[PDB]
Design a protein around this motif. Sequence first.
Motif, PDB file in Angstrom:
ATOM      1  N   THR A 164      43.133  10.601  -2.434  1.00 57.54           N
ATOM      2  CA  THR A 164      42.706  11.822  -3.101  1.00 57.54           C
ATOM      3  C   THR A 164      41.351  12.275  -2.569  1.00 57.54           C
ATOM      4  O   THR A 164      40.545  11.460  -2.097  1.00 57.54           O
ATOM      5  N   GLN A 165      41.105  13.578  -2.651  1.00 57.31           N
ATOM      6  CA  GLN A 165      39.868  14.145  -2.151  1.00 57.31           C
ATOM      7  C   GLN A 165      39.445  15.369  -2.979  1.00 57.31           C
ATOM      8  O   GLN A 165      40.281  16.124  -3.495  1.00 57.31           O
ATOM      9  N   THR A 166      38.134  15.511  -3.127  1.00 59.15           N
ATOM     10  CA  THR A 166      37.518  16.657  -3.764  1.00 59.15           C
ATOM     11  C   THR A 166      36.534  17.304  -2.806  1.00 59.15           C
ATOM     12  O   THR A 166      35.713  16.628  -2.181  1.00 59.15           O
ATOM     13  N   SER A 198      37.829  22.117  -5.352  1.00 66.10           N
ATOM     14  CA  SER A 198      39.244  22.057  -4.981  1.00 66.10           C
ATOM     15  C   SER A 198      39.618  20.595  -4.702  1.00 66.10           C
ATOM     16  O   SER A 198      38.780  19.812  -4.273  1.00 66.10           O
ATOM     17  N   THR A 199      40.864  20.227  -4.982  1.00 62.01           N
ATOM     18  CA  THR A 199      41.294  18.829  -4.888  1.00 62.01           C
ATOM     19  C   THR A 199      42.669  18.694  -4.243  1.00 62.01           C
ATOM     20  O   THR A 199      43.446  19.663  -4.191  1.00 62.01           O
ATOM     21  N   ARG A 200      42.956  17.485  -3.751  1.00 64.06           N
ATOM     22  CA  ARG A 200      44.198  17.214  -3.045  1.00 64.06           C
ATOM     23  C   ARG A 200      44.522  15.735  -3.109  1.00 64.06           C
ATOM     24  O   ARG A 200      43.633  14.903  -3.264  1.00 64.06           O
ATOM     25  N   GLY A 201      45.808  15.425  -3.019  1.00 59.97           N
ATOM     26  CA  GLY A 201      46.280  14.054  -3.049  1.00 59.97           C
ATOM     27  C   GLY A 201      47.483  13.894  -2.145  1.00 59.97           C
ATOM     28  O   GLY A 201      48.390  14.731  -2.160  1.00 59.97           O
ATOM     29  N   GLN A 211      48.910  13.109 -12.536  1.00 53.98           N
ATOM     30  CA  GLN A 211      49.712  12.799 -11.362  1.00 53.98           C
ATOM     31  C   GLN A 211      49.576  11.330 -11.003  1.00 53.98           C
ATOM     32  O   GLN A 211      48.500  10.750 -11.125  1.00 53.98           O
ATOM     33  N   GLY A 228      41.046  14.128  -8.615  1.00 56.16           N
ATOM     34  CA  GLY A 228      41.857  15.331  -8.632  1.00 56.16           C
ATOM     35  C   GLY A 228      42.875  15.263  -7.520  1.00 56.16           C
ATOM     36  O   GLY A 228      42.538  14.865  -6.398  1.00 56.16           O
ATOM     37  N   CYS A 229      44.113  15.648  -7.827  1.00 56.52           N
ATOM     38  CA  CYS A 229      45.211  15.577  -6.867  1.00 56.52           C
ATOM     39  C   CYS A 229      45.727  16.929  -6.410  1.00 56.52           C
ATOM     40  O   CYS A 229      46.555  16.982  -5.507  1.00 56.52           O
ATOM     41  N   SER A 230      45.307  18.005  -7.072  1.00 56.56           N
ATOM     42  CA  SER A 230      45.707  19.350  -6.660  1.00 56.56           C
ATOM     43  C   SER A 230      44.972  20.402  -7.486  1.00 56.56           C
ATOM     44  O   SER A 230      44.674  20.172  -8.664  1.00 56.56           O
ATOM     45  N   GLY A 231      44.667  21.543  -6.869  1.00 55.45           N
ATOM     46  CA  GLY A 231      44.038  22.644  -7.578  1.00 55.45           C
ATOM     47  C   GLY A 231      42.597  22.363  -7.961  1.00 55.45           C
ATOM     48  O   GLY A 231      41.895  21.614  -7.282  1.00 55.45           O
ATOM     49  N   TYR A 232      42.162  22.968  -9.064  1.00 50.28           N
ATOM     50  CA  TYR A 232      40.771  22.922  -9.500  1.00 50.28           C
ATOM     51  C   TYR A 232      40.686  22.382 -10.924  1.00 50.28           C
ATOM     52  O   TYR A 232      40.372  23.122 -11.852  1.00 50.28           O
TER      53      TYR A 232
END
Lengths: 307, 306
Positions: free
Chosen positions: A112-114, A120-123, B107, B216-220
Amino acid sequence: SKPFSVPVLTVEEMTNSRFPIPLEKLFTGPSSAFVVQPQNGRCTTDGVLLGTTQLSPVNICTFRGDVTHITGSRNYTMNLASQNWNDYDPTEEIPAPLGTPDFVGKIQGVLTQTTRTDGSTRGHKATVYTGSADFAPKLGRVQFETDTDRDFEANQNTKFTPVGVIQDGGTTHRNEPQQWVLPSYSGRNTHNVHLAPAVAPTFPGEQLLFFRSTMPGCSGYPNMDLDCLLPQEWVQYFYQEAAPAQSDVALLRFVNPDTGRVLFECKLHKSGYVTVAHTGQHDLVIPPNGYFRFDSWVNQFYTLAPM
Amino acid sequence: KPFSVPVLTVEEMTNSRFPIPLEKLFTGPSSAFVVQPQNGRCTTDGVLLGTTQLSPVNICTFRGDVTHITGSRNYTMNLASQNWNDYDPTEEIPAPLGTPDFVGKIQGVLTQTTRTDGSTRGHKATVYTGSADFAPKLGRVQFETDTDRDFEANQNTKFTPVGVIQDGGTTHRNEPQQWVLPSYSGRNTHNVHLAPAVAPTFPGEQLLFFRSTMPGCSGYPNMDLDCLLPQEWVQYFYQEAAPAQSDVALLRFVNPDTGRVLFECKLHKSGYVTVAHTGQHDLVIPPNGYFRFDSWVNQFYTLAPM
Ligand SMILES: C[C@@H]1O[C@@H](O[C@@H]2[C@@H](O[C@H]3O[C@H](CO)[C@H](O)[C@H](O)[C@H]3O)[C@@H](O)[C@@H](CO)O[C@@H]2O)[C@@H](O)[C@H](O)[C@@H]1O
Ligand SMILES: C[C@@H]1O[C@@H](O[C@@H]2[C@@H](O[C@H]3O[C@H](CO)[C@H](O)[C@H](O)[C@H]3O)[C@@H](O)[C@@H](CO)O[C@@H]2O)[C@@H](O)[C@H](O)[C@@H]1O
């Protein structure tokens, strides 16, 4: 002299010290044919942490840092930071960053990253192969295989959360992971350093007592068995109590609180592991609310009753 | 038995509402909303409350068997206990122990093992704890996954939480809502056996929160997560069960390096902390700082401003 003791937690209430999952059972087996030298879940009875052992149950087999994309691939190299995002010091007198995996296998989880500026975030699904030439946590770098070649940004805080392990289903079943084979912490063609020592029963008729969990499997036919020498809660407890050892061996009784009866007795060695008088592989049958109690310090000739 | 708190530092300890480390101490006003978390709830004399259990790694996990919802990638999980025993919905608790205590989209990964041959599988999975079909108290929750066929029926299945998500096309940081409790028995039901809401009662006081940032895994998403007690404090109190001599325990936060008290606070018997401060404030503390129980005090003790 502060008295020694162990926690009153049941086995099911406690946590594996080598992977962030609960204990399931107690298991004893012979171990003359392999080397038992785990680096997580290593602590003396008077609370000195050893190997790669640290206090957080949830930080075991986690990684934090920033990532660089390996061009032409879905792979990323993580430049490791410490658990609190401080710089990692490769000269520290430890085998690898504290909490680094201590077995050779393929650990699947999520990266995961911020992005600091906008939140904004992603996994992404990610695997770390701890037997890889490029698994070099001691040097501050490990490689992750992911399902993206573009989504992760450079220079942003990135975390690996472990979930479980995988195996190649087209090869012999349960051949990996190998829980008693240490990674080479500085990568291919290097020797590990500052290891907590290997452990073995020395007394006739005795075997190690393991605190066993089953790691989640995410693909194929993995060997999900995971044995630790001490529960993570025992590590935490000893660290805090710092009770001096009055001898090399603490006699413990495993008791049923409902009946006041001792199910079995065992030796908690001062350097941080347990033995029992038994021969062969055996899953212990225990009452669910059973727990361990310190009896007394004993000398080097104490013989355990068969368990 | 004398009462005490652990000597672990804030960074050495774990959030009791999600399986991640503590990062910092934070205080702020909370008069305008309800602070009623169900995880990380324990009295100083060792009574567990709400959905609180002892294992740090079981927080926001689910276990059971799954049934495929035809025409979809969604699965219903029929919950078991953490040790794979049958789940009993008549037990006098709000929901299974360790159930999430906030409304959001969590998630993680659903993993499964096939008992007969040891074949295994893992898939991305999200649980929406504000969903009508989020009914953990009744023994059912729904997961949205990335498969419509890989999971088998009547096989042990586990959800390992990773982080939270948000819809990026709507107002940023509007979810999760950490202080909004799920309806544990699903839509149009009322929660039962809750640990009580907490508020400072003394003039000039605010809650002290033990704060983490959820991945966080997606979005804001709003990744802020505040718990009333560290998980290690829950563990400590449950085992010590030291009798409370009053309703309020005076704690000092001390630097072992110099012996200076950065501040003092009230650890209330029913299991939460308050400080003398007005406004939102991230506390600046030394990493080797820790809490020390000094004495039991009455209802009239005025804290040194922090
Ligand atoms: C033993 C087997 O392990 C897993 O299957 C993998 C394959 O995984 C891929 O296909 C499966 C369906 O067969 C699924 O769609 C999964 O999402 C996908 O990644 C694949 O990696 C091959 C390649 O060697 O190995 C296994 O067949 C698991 O999905 C199965 O349920 C089963 O446990
Ligand atoms: C804010 C944004 O959140 C994430 O992106 C998601 C999208 O996720 C999908 O697309 C992204 C690329 O933008 C990526 O390929 C990911 O693997 C894939 O699932 C998507 O869910 C949309 C739907 O509205 O929301 C976001 O755009 C994240 O991947 C991005 O890095 C970024 O933080």
